[PDB]
Structures are given as C-alpha cells and as structure tokens.
Amino acid sequence: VYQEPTDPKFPQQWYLSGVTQRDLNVKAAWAQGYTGHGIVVSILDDGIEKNHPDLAGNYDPGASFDVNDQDPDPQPRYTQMNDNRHGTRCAGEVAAVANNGVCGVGVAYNARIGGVRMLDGEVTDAVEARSLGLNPNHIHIYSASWGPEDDGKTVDGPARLAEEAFFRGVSQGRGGLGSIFVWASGNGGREHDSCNCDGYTNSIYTLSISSATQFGNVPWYSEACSSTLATTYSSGNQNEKQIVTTDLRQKCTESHTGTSASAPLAAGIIALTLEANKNLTWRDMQHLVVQTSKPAHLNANDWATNGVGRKVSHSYGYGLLDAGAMVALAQNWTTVAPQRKCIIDILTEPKDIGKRLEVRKTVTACLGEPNHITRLEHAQARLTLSYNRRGDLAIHLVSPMGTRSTLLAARPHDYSADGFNDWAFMTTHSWDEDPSGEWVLEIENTSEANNYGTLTKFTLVLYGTASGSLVPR
Ligand SMILES: C[NH+]1CCN(c2ncc(Oc3cc(C[N@@H+]4CC[C@H](OCC(=O)O)C4)cc(-c4cc(Cl)cc(Cl)c4)n3)cn2)CC1
Numbered sequence: 487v488y489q490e491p492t493d494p495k496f497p498q499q500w501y502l503s504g505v506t507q508r509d510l511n512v513k514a515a516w517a518q519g520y521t522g523h524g525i526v527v528s529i530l531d532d533g534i535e536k537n538h539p540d541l542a543g544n545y546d547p548g549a550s551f552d553v554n555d556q557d558p559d560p561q562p563r564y565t566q567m568n569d570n571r572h573g574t575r576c577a578g579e580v581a582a583v584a585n586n587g588v589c590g591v592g593v594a595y596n597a598r599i600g601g602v603r604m605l606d607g608e609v610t611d612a613v614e615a616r617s618l619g620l621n622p623n624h625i626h627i628y629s630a631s632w633g634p635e636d637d638g639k640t641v642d643g644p645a646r647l648a649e650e651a652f653f654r655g656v657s658q659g660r661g662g663l664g665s666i667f668v669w670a671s672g673n674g675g676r677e678h679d680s681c682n683c684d685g686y687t688n689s690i691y692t693l694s695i696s697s698a699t700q701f702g703n704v705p706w707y708s709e710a711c712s713s714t715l716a717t718t719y720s721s722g723n724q725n726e727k728q729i730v731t732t733d734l735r736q737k738c739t740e741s742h743t744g745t746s747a748s749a750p751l752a753a754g755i756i757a758l759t760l761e762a763n764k765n766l767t768w769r770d771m772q773h774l775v776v777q778t779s780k781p782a783h784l785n786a787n788d789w790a791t792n793g794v795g796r797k798v799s800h801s802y803g804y805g806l807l808d809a810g811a812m813v814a815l816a817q818n819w820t821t822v823a824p825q826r827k828c829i830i831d832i833l834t835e836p837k838d839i840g841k842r843l844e845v846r847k848t849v850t851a852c853l854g855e856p857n858h859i860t861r862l863e864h865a866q867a868r869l870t871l872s873y874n875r876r877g878d879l880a881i882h883l884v885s886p887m888g889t890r891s892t893l894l895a896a897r898p899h900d901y902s903a904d905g906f907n908d909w910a911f912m913t914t915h916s917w918d919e920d921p922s923g924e925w926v927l928e929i930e931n932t933s934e935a936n937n938y939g940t941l942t943k944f945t946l947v948l949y950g951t952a953s954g955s956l957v958p959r
Pocket residue numbers: 530531532572605606609610611614615617618630631632633634635642643644645646648
C-alpha cells in the first residue's frame with residue numbers, strides 16, 4: 487500500500503532510498519506510517535527561507551526566531567553572494583514537503599520545521615542561550631550544524647548561559663522529557679581536528695553525528711572522536727553523490743556537503759522516532775541510537791568491539807543511523823531509569839607527563855550508594871593539565887572491560903601552551919558496560935620534541951543506571 491514520494495529530485499536522494507542497501511532505511515519507517523506528523527524541529531543557523539515552495543507547507547513560526555536582529559522572522563539576509571543559504575538547505579533535509587512536484591523530500595516530510603537566525607552576526611553566549619532555549623515546550627528537536635572554529639587548534643565549549651540552556655532544556659524542556667539537541671561533529675578533517683575539543687558536540691546533552699561518503703568512506707572533512715554516537719551519509723569525492731535539498735531563492739541544490747549536512751538528516755530520523763513514541767526522554771533517544779546503528783559497509787581502520795559486543799569507531803560512533811530500526815524499537819521502549827552520576831577523583835598528587843604517563847585506578851562506581859552505576863551511559867575524564875605544546879598530546883582511556891577510547895588525538899596545528907582547564911573529554915564507546923574495576927588513562931607526547939607538563943586533576947565522571955541490561959551482542 488505505501489507509495490514512495492513522486493518529487494522530481496527524490497530519485498537523486500540516494501541516502502533516503504536505494505536498491506543497493508547503502509541508505510538510511512527511511513522508506514521502512516515511512517511504510518510503517520511514520521513521516522514526522524506532530525513533531526517540531528528547529529534549525530539553529532543563518533535563517534530559514536520560510537516562503538520556499540518546498541518548506542512553506544511545513545513551516546512553523548512557533549519553531550522560529552531571529553536572535554541576531556531580535557524579532558520573530560528568521561528570513562535570511564539576501565546578498566549577491568548567497569551567503570545565508572545554509573539554514574534553508576538544512577531545513578529541507580529535515581522537512582521538505584513531499585508529493586508536491588518540487589525538489590525532493592525531507593526525512594520527516596510531515597514534520598513542522600522552523601529556523602533560528604543566530605549565525606548572521608556575532609555569536610555570543612547570550613545569543614546561543616536564547617537559541618538553545620527557544621520555545622522549549624513547543625520545539626521537540628534542535629539541529630545545529632556548526633560550533634567553534636574547525637581550525638584544529640581551538641578548545642572551546644558552551645560558556646555559562648549556553649550550558650545553562652542545555653541543562654534547562656534536557657531537564658524541563660518537552661514537558662520534562664528533555665529537548666533533543668542534534669549536533670554535527672565538525673568539518674575540521676583537513677586541519678586534523680579532534681572533535682572532543684568542541685564542547686558542543688563533546689557534551690552528553692547533544693546527540694552527535696558524523697558523516698560517511700556514498701562509497702562508505704570517512705570523508706576528507708570528518709573529525710574522529712569518542713563523543714560521536716552515530717553517522718549519516720553526506721558528501722565525499724567528485725565521483726560520489728551529495729545531499730539534495732531546498733536552497734536559497736526558492737531553488738533546489740544537488741550539492742549540499744559536510745558533516746553540517748549530516749546532522750539535519752539525523753534530526754529528521756529522530757523526528758520519525760519521536761512520532762513512534764512521544765514519551766521518549768532525551769536519554770532514551772541516545773539509547774535507541776546506540777542499539778540500532780549499523781556499522782556494516784562503513785570503512786575505518788579503528789572498528790573495535792566494546793565490552794557489550796557492539797562495534798564502535800571514532801569516525802562513525804555505533805555506525806549509520808537506521809530509521810526503520812529506530813522506529814520499530816521505539817514503539818515498545820521502556821523509559822530508562824533516572825540518570826545517576828558517580829564522581830571519582832582519581833589523583834592523590836600532581837603527575838609529570840614527560841614522554842608518557844599512565845594513571846591506573848580501580849573504582850567501585852559508587853557501590854552501596856544511590857548513584858551506584860552498573861550500566862554506563864557517557865563517561866568523562868575531566869582533565870586539568872599544563873603542557874608546552876598542546877597538539878603533541880594524545881590521550882586514551884581504557885575501561886575495565888578493555889574498551890580503548892581515544893579522548894584526544896595529536897593535533898599538528900595546535901601550538902597552544904594553555905593546556906586543558908578541567909576539560910570534560912567524553913566517550914560513548916563504553917555505553918552499557920559495567921564501570922567497576924580498573925580504568926587506565928594514558929597521556930603521551932606523540933612528537934620527538936622534549937615537551938613538558940603536569941597533570942594536576944583527573945576526575946572520572948560516570949553517568950548511568952543500575953538495572954535493565956540486555957545480554958551482550
Ligand atoms: C558559512 N557559515 C558557517 C557557520 N557559521 C558559523 N558562524 C559562527 C560560528 O561560531 C560559533 C562559535 C561557537 C562557540 N561560542 C562562541 C561564543 C562562546 O564563547 C563566549 C564566552 O566565552 O563567553 C563560545 C558556537 C557556535 C554555535 C553554533 C550553532 Cl549552529 C549553535 C550554537 Cl548554540 C552555537 N558557533 C560557527 N559557525 C556562519 C558562517
């Protein structure tokens with residue numbers, strides 16, 4: 487009975503549907519009756535062309551605001567160079583109207599879509615907070631494709647107001663179930679960037695997404711890191727197809743690119759999942775992504791099996807999002823137990839880094855206490871250290887189950903002498919593992935230079951629950 491979209495550019499949306507099994511399995515969700523009805527997604531970017539022929543039908547003023555000019559209208563500023571087109575491109579990926587003879591379709595082509603015009607001007611902490619905290623009892627999912635500079639030498643994250651907006655969002659947003667913040671892991675690949683240095687994607691409150699090329703490869707712009715959860719297809723080389731979506735000036739583009747095009751496809755899949763079960767919390771959504779993502783056909787030299795039998799990669803997280811599997815598992819999903827937080831201060835004194843430093847600690851994960859964790863979700867190693875050349879450091883964290891997470895890879899362009907000031911390096915690779923036992927932190931100087939520094943604090947922060955495990959994969 488299900489009839490696929492008839493839009494002129496839908497056959498060119500190879501990532502939505504394809505006979506070759508190299509797609510996001512979105513037709514399977516559409517055939518099950520999930521197209522995004524009743525869900526509301528907002529794009530945090532340079533504005534949205536609300537009158538675009540493929541967006542007008544799903545446009546929602548209630549999911550929109552212009553934070554740069556302080557008004558409700560997020561219309562982009564038109565320039566001869568078409569600079570403010572990215573938000574319109576992202577909005578079409580999520581919710582371009584289907585069966586209307588225009589361009590292609592959104593992943594959640596019946597969802598309501600809005601945009602926050604926030605990148606066309608100075609991006610301050612207050613601007614970010616007003617964007618992240620926009621109408622949190624109406625907007626279900628926020629999609630953000632950018633963050634701090636992808637120059638491979640920046641370490642930056644949300645300042646106080648933005649971090650408070652994430653807290654308020656996941657706690658009180660969406661009737662207490664929590665705002666779903668979807669984030670692109672970054673486009674700093676050619677600068678050898680490591681995405682744990684970007685506090686927005688490295689946050690536990692954001693559901694971070696990386697990219698795969700059409701032939702299943704790690705694109706030139708991709709950043710590897712342990713905070714990434716999953717992947718969606720995006721652009722690659724000039725023999726590989728790209729993202730087909732709505733463009734500025736009521737046009738259609740077949741050349742939308744980067745990890746900044748992967749996050750909106752994930753926001754659309756998350757919108758279909760939320761239609762299958764409106765009661766999913768922000769943490770339930772991250773659990774569904776971990777359980778249903780598919781490593782198959784994604785090529786990487788770092789695929790590793792974690793303590794619970796799941797394959798995980800620093801380029802792809804748990805693999806490609808699978809919309810059909812996400813919606814099937816969401817329908818009878820049991821709400822996860824409240825989040826526990828176990829804080830373990832690992833150091834009894836400062837430690838010289840030198841050429842290499844290994845810190846081992848056997849932990850009980852708050853045994854006998856209400857914050858006892860037997861099922862890990864996110865794990866953070868909050869490090870404070872001084873170092874003369876930050877980019878020469880590579881940091882790893884091995885969990886008691888043997889899962890080796892790269893917290894920081896060498897960044898050749900990072901010459902900073904500022905070190906890390908309580909930086910919360912996060913990993914999703916030990917999800918569902920029992921955190922009891924020996925944790926090992928390894929800090930190494932990857933260069934031949936006589937570098938020097940000291941680790942002054944290592945707090946291992948574990949998040950999770952103490953019940954409801956599945957039999958390992
Ligand atoms: C072609 N196009 C490409 C996209 N683009 C662009 N423009 C600016 C930009 O920069 C930042 C920087 C930061 C770090 N912030 C900055 C201020 C805070 O520090 C203040 C403090 O310390 O108080 C830390 C955050 C964000 C950010 C982005 C999204 Cl999407 C949503 C949210 Cl919530 C935040 N954007 C990224 N992309 C426009 C041009």
